[PDB]
DNA sequence: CCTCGTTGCGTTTGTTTGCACGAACCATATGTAAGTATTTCCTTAGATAACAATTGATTGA
């Protein structure tokens, strides 16, 4: 489950980096300090919860592999 | 000499930090007990020598 954590982790802050720290506060409904204080301090408790709760997802470099393999062979 | 690559500067977009501000949850301080109830213990061992101070008896006047 640590090293479940620990991808977690990364997948998450890697969607608020993409989504953007600023746009993801307007979207959540906080300012962009409180996602900016998020990542370093409840981001990777929540992310061992994740663990724990078994909710890890694709990580997305294989999710492209995986579509670009869909549309070779279709 | 003109022209093109490198640097100084400001601009735009985006992110973390420093204060101040509720909120809530626990930590502290304080108060209130209405059968009667009434003067304490406990500890500790086999030194020895020297020196003053203090207290008590003896004696010169």
Partial sequence: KRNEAL?????????????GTEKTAEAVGVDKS????WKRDW??????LLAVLEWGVVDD???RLARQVA???T
Avoid at 43 to 48: A, G, L
């Fill in 7 to 19: 991808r977690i982790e990364s997948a998450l802050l890697n969607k608020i980096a993409m989504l």
């Fill in 61 to 63: 470099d294989m999710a």
């Fill in 71 to 73: 549309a070779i062979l």
């Fill in 43 to 48: 981001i990777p408790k929540f992310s061992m």
């Fill in 34 to 37: 409180q996602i900016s204080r």
